[PDB]
Amino acid sequence: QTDMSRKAFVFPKESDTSYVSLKAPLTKPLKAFTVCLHFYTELSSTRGYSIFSYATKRQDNEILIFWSKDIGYSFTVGGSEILFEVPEVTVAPVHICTSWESASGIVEFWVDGKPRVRKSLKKGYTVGAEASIILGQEQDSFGGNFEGSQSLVGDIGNVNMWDFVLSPDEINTIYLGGPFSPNVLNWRALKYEVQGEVFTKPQLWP
Amino acid sequence: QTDMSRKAFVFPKESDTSYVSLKAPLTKPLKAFTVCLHFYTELSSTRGYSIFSYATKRQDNEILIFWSKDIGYSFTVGGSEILFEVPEVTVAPVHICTSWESASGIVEFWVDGKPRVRKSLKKGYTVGAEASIILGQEQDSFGGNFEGSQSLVGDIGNVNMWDFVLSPDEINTIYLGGPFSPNVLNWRALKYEVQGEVFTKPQLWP
Amino acid sequence: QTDMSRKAFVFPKESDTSYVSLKAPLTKPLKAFTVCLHFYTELSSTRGYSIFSYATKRQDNEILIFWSKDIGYSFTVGGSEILFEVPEVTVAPVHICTSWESASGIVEFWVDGKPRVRKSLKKGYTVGAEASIILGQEQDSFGGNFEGSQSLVGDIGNVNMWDFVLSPDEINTIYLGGPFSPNVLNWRALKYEVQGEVFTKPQLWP
Amino acid sequence: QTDMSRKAFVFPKESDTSYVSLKAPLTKPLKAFTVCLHFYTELSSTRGYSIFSYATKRQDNEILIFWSKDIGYSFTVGGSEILFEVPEVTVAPVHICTSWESASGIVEFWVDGKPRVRKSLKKGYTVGAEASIILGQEQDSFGGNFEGSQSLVGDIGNVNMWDFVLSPDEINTIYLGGPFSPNVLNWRALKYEVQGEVFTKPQLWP
Amino acid sequence: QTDMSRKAFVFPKESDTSYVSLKAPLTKPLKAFTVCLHFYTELSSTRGYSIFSYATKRQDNEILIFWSKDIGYSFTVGGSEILFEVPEVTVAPVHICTSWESASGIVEFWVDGKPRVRKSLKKGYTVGAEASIILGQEQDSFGGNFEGSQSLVGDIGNVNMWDFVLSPDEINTIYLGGPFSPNVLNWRALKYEVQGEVFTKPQLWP
Numbered sequence A, B, C, D, E: 001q002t003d004m005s006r007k008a009f010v011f012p013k014e015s016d017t018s019y020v021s022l023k024a025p026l027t028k029p030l031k032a033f034t035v036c037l038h039f040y041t042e043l044s045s046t047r048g049y050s051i052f053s054y055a056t057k058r059q060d061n062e063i064l065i066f067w068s069k070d071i072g073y074s075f076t077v078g079g080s081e082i083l084f085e086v087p088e089v090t091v092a093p094v095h096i097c098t099s100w101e102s103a104s105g106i107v108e109f110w111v112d113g114k115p116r117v118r119k120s121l122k123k124g125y126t127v128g129a130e131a132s133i134i135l136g137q138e139q140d141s142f143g144g145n146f147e148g149s150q151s152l153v154g155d156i157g158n159v160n161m162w163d164f165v166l167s168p169d170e171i172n173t174i175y176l177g178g179p180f181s182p183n184v185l186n187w188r189a190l191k192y193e194v195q196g197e198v199f200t201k202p203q204l205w206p
Ligand SMILES: [Ca+2]
Pocket: A138, A139, A140, A145, A146, A147, A150
């Protein structure tokens, strides 16, 4: 229950041990969701890394946002991957919002307030309710099995999550810095646990 | 009779079966026309696809707007094709308005509010009045014979059609979001029929 | 005596027969002149074409503005040519004003309101008073001998001509859409004769 | 005690002897610091050079900002180096602010008001209080041992230093020209000593 | 004693004979100076042109500004040269102001209101007072070159000269069109002599 406003978690060096665990008070299993966050790293040009890792006992990669070197954004839900190609990679903080809906399988990926085309993925599936949500490390087992070749080195912040799909207008205000209320993960009332070489400093992005 | 305002039809995956049929209450055969629409796809770089297919019992390709891979926009009326070359293809929603006039054969193609040069095509011809207008699939027979290699994968919306040629100023307000009244196909009073894997979601373009 | 305001002549297809003859009530032979016009074509990238052709019985190319493929603007007065190189060709309507002065031979070429350097050409010469001025075709004989490989395909409009040299400030208002009064060719009181496949439509440039 | 406002030190030619010594009234050893400055040189494309050299009797390179040819900014504190790669080098005045914190080892490097990612360097270390701070030359011994291959040729000015870490907002006003009060080195109340071919002229950057 | 305001000298063709001599009523020898001017030419072959040539009986190249496409700016004072090369080649009129100070040898070169780095050249030297100042051609007094000098082809104007070094703020107003008073060469009270194929026409730059 910490107001993480104007703050960001910063992982200064490549580790096997650093990560931040996010505690979500989930009761009902997810039939849709929207997760937005701000990250800033320099790895994009050399290796892949994990941005957001939502794992279940049954499925280690229930919902995962990853940057795969030389390709682009790799959005995977329920163990099934999908790609959002990004040819020219630029170094600057980046803000992403991604959403999925069981009813149609339509997944949207918004990078810096601008939408990528809509794709289909895991229609009819249903995301597990009890999960280990980790920032900065790649989960390969419920809350563990971290491969350092997929660790995040840089800053990450403003992570929020809704249990429904945000509309283009809402996704826009989130980007522009408008007022909103998440209902799963809330950066203004975040309940987390730090582990390793990770510090809390003022955010670099405005 | 549905107000499709702020909405778009979205074809999430490559199909042989998905399409949307538009019902136009046409009585008089067309001697000119203007059709404008907004589409957003990622196919441009790999294959060709059908944007707008107006077919008659006698002529399957009465009026057809198509993107032919590596070339550009392919505007065909009355079975006769014409090309609007587009070298550097970019991924972003795009808005096009195209018009034809029997009296001179002059066809204009406006991409994103800016006009391409005027070309001549099918002078003296006259477009059939009873037609099957389909979105997302390529007609090769009245209301059927769909080739999946020409299906549209992405969003399409704001389709409107006039039975006369819009002026540069009108075409401009349509683009900029001004008020106007179509007299053949009206996105604000659309009468359609969905078939297959196609959903109605909020438009991504502003 | 037609007010061609807000209009443009449009040559939709490659011809050997289409052109527009402009009638100028000239009495005194020219010792200087300024001719401005707006044109919009897509040929620039493939072939050369004639923009403005002023011919005399004695000299078929008394004053001629031409685009020679891969080089740039070719301004020729009195059979003698001069070049205004344009490396990167862009497709959009373009406005040009060009002027010549017998007294010094200084010829200016203004493209889109911005001046190219001053060059010398045909000093002391004197342009013939009785001439055939044609739009869209390349004259090789008084009022004839059209080579289709030099025809114009696109729109052309706002042609005006003065018997003196416009100053930078005047050339500027002409560009910006200010008020002025030509004294040879006047687009507001144009006296022309159409021949072939050429139509009069609303101008695409603002 | 000179108001160096609107002024810059200028080293016109490559020397072995030119430099400016800055006198800081330091009592407590540094546990953190922020140093900002403006420099403008043309060497970037041919050789490396010293921007800011803070030396102690025990450690000649206590805190040093250097540009290493073909690589980028080389920030070293306590003899330990770290790199901020800059691929495309541009010639224009540049403003940099850099900071370090013993408590975490986090070092920030801001170039022209925009932040580079955060890196870790010399955690737990503590910078010496009695030091020789030199501008324009590379120290390899307390107050001496200058290698001319690392001399600065150009202008340098607006150097300020704080004993704490400036926040993003503060670093921003410093850049934008807001009001602030340094507490180690103050360009408004600078106490220096010039040596060699160095002059004081009006700054070229705004 | 002519108000050359809003005018420019124009050399239409490559000559061996065309030039403009400027008469300066100098009494005291120069210990510093600032010379600004506007020129506009068509950066052609390796053959560059002389922009400003200030010659003495003793030294033919007392102060000379020379520009060649594939070289950049060559500023020479007292027979000794120095180079300022400008990267992006903009095809448009250009305005330069350059200054030198005997006391330090610092020479500044400002192109289009923006400063290039400060360099050292001819410290302690002193420019001759009785000189032949020529526009449009290099000046090598007592004859002796094997072949001609070959003149600038284009327009040149707004030449002014001060016997002291202009500050950044002054150099800025001169560029932006503010009011000032030269004290050696004054474009508002210019005393010149034309020779050859050179005309006085309205300036193309604003
Ligand atoms: Ca893993």
